[PDB]
Ligand SMILES: Cc1cc2c(s1)N=C1N(c3ccc(N4CCOCC4)cc3)CC[C@@]1(O)C2=O
Ligand SMILES: Nc1ncnc2c1ncn2[C@@H]1O[C@H](COP(=O)(O)OP(=O)(O)O)[C@@H](O)[C@H]1O
Ligand code: VO4
């Protein structure tokens with residue numbers, strides 16, 4: 001139906017293959033016994049034509065003309081040409097690794113990046129902008145059922161919205177993936193979808209909230225040029241009818257360490273480079289800075305420029321987002337000024353006094369700029385750093401500080417200002433998004449920092465990778481546990497199956513009492529504790545006692561076998577990273593600042609990791625009370641190359657995500673379920689005579705009678721207590737029959753109209 | 768094909784159909800143009816689509832419809848074939864088809880919504896034909912009781 005796809009416009013060839021290609025696939029010959037996939041050393045799996053089968057081995061000729069021989073256990077059956085580039089992989093005759101691999105590969109080769117996998121969706125990063133996110137495409141997806149339109153992030157969004165109204169339930173859209181997979185892009189598309197359907201309106205403000213927070217919380221990393229260094233859960237609130245009422249953003253821990261530290265091949269937060277890009281020369285003047293990042297110690301330890309990023313154009317986007325969000329002129333200045341002060345703090349120099357270990361300023365020029373930007377007296381700032389108060393009501397009793405203690409405190413203060421400003425911006429955005437409209441339900445979109453492996457992995461990477469493990473286990477519990485219980489709850493005949501998808505071994509190791517975080521938190525409460533005493537406790541009760549806790553063989557201190565791979569961690573400074581101490585004397589000066597924003601930033605757990613675990617636990621608890629929709633992002637290659645796909649990398653991701661296992665439960669189970677009242681209402685059209693008006697049959701009985709009267713395989717559905725459950729594809733068939741029946745009834749109604757008019761005209765001729 | 772149609776209409780019915788068919792003769796040659804065939808099949812009680820009418824005539828081009836003529840003897844088996852091809856559409860089937868455009872709860876679709884459907888979907892009807900069907904159908908505010916509309920066209 002190339003006419004039906006014309007509503008998508010220029011996006012049509014990128015969402016669904018042509019009607020000509022579909023007809024060619026239907027008429028392409030195929031010998032089932034000779035068309036096979038064969039395991040390959042170089043490519044993992046290759047398509048091949050069997051030449052000979054003998055003595056338990058198969059000799060086949062590949063597409064590339066090469067002759068290959070394998071045992072019969074390494075030969076997989078190929079699906080026929082009608083299943084080429086299939087939109088739902090749960091519909092393939094044969095489901096195995098090469099089939100899923102090659103379906104994703106072939107769809108990706110036509111630039112079709114979305115593909116259904118039973119109850120969830122998979123997306124492979126194109127590394128290029130495709131015209132599939134136009135306003136015309138948003139329009140085309142509105143109201144469409146999952147079967148009525150090509151796979152897309154907009155369809156997942158719309159479907160979640162439909163479930164929200166029909167079940168009167170909160171929904172959540174959970175987007176999976178390792179660093180650089182496409183979680184942030186897909187999160188922004190979900191936001192775009194719901195928003196589309198001077199200070200801006202709620203719709204403009206929801207859209208603009210991301211570019212602002214990305215300037216301050218995203219940074220270039222080895223795996224991603226725009227890496228999210230904070231997690232977010234955006235709730236989009238809707239009223240009883242389904243009108244977009246409000247929105248809110250919740251952010252989790254920001255990676256504060258990045259403000260003052262960078263590895264060789266990474267940058268700090270985008271904002272520093274955006275400011276110094278000189279697109280707005282007035283900002284350079286206002287902040288008392290230069291356009292050379294190398295002049296700032298805290299933000300020039302790694303890279304400075306990123307070929308894919310135009311820091312000038314991005315500064316315009318950040319400034320424009322501040323305008324749409326409605327920050328006052330004073331608030332906007334304070335945001336930039338505090339950022340400038342953070343840069344200056346890093347350049348402050350200190351030296352020991354003669355015959356002492358006590359610190360004293362090594363010049364005051366830098367301190368003068370930072371204090372100007374913070375509306376503080378620079379002499380008070382320097383005295384508070386070198387001589388902090390012991391007691392609250394006494395300014396005479398002070399403790400000394402060495403040069404290293406002052407530098408450390410300066411780092412901690414710069415991070416606290418930055419982090420608190422980041423949290424204040426979120427608070428401000430939320431005040432703008434709170435329309436005070438009545439709200440009944442919401443759809444939450446989760447965008448966490450993805451699984452990452454660097455050359456050096458610290459406490460930040462452990463928390464990020466643990467968050468990913470907890471989220472993979474949430475998918476596992478939903479797909480392989482709650483789904484089976486859902487069948488039993490509805491009275492459907494079902495014998496439990498153990499899918500063996502359970503990450504409890506690694507999760508227990510990290511979060512159980514006496515686990516890694518428990519040992520770290522325990523060592524934080526001993527002032528005599530060192531990195532080595534922490535390393536020793538970890539080894540004493542986890543090495544050789546847990547299979548997921550290993551020593552690195554070929555530097556790192558321990559290795560954890562995560563769901564997505566083995567990661568080598570280094571425990572240097574973990575005790576210092578887990579405590580959040582500030583110089584309270586300097587905090588007192590910030591509270592008294594004439595800069596109202598800074599004074600506001602400084603006006604409950606014992607460690608940072610305990611707060612982290614609670615944020616994580618609260619999120620998982622909240623997600624339990626929603627109907628989740630999973631989007632699994634996949635990177636095709638590790639070089640950001642558009643269109644190129646490394647087979648083993650994709651297979652690795654499919655495996656640890658449990659994609660094939662998830663497709664298997666959708667094939668064995670009933671992935672589609674409709675409430676009887678909603679079924680009767682939608683599909684009576686198929687055979688209205690089966691449910692005549694004169695009978696007062698209830699919704700459930702009418703559905704039974706209707707399904708039993710149409711040409712459908714009667715084994716593809718089962719009756720639950722409140723819903724009819726369907727095997728994969730039956731809803732697509734019912735939807736296809738509905739579309740056909742509605743088209744016929746319109747022409748038949750027109751034929752009646754034509755008949756009516758011809759008979760009234762004939763009546764006039766008779767008289 | 769037409770030769771293979773067995774005529775089932777009674778002698779009385781055939782004579783009445785001939786009298787009705789001849790009211791459409793505009794030139795005195797006892798023939799009608801193919802373009803009038805649809806109107807005569809409909810006048811006699813059938814409800815064929817323009818596709819079914821074209822099919823009985825042996826799928827003639829748009830020019831052949833206006834230029835070629837037909838005698839009652841050749842039209843008669845065509846009427847029989849259309850009558851045998853029992854135009855299946857029940858009253859409830861039509862209200863379910865129109866119920867799709869409800870938008871609201873009550874059994875009433877909007878005025879211009881029904882006009883758009885009849886004039887742009889399926890076998891597109893002329894604007895003037897759709898206006899004739901709306902013979903005092905739109906209530907105040909501009910809405911039509913689709914259940915009542917189906918009874919009206921089926922009357
Ligand atoms: C539901 C949550 C999501 C989520 C969480 S929580 N946590 C995060 N990130 C983080 C965690 C801990 C630390 N710390 C812990 C203390 O020692 C230093 C590193 C720093 C950043 C950085 C990315 C992140 O926001 C995220 O994606
Ligand atoms: N749908 C997409 N279309 C085009 N490029 C994309 C898409 N999703 C991701 N990318 C590319 O990948 C980059 C990183 O995506 P992103 O979502 O930020 O990864 P992460 O999941 O780490 O947030 C994008 O900046 C862009 O270059
Ligand atoms: O670069 V990520 O959004 O996977 O942290």
Ligand SMILES: [Mg+2]
Nearest residue numbers: 183184227228
């Ligand atoms: Mg991101």
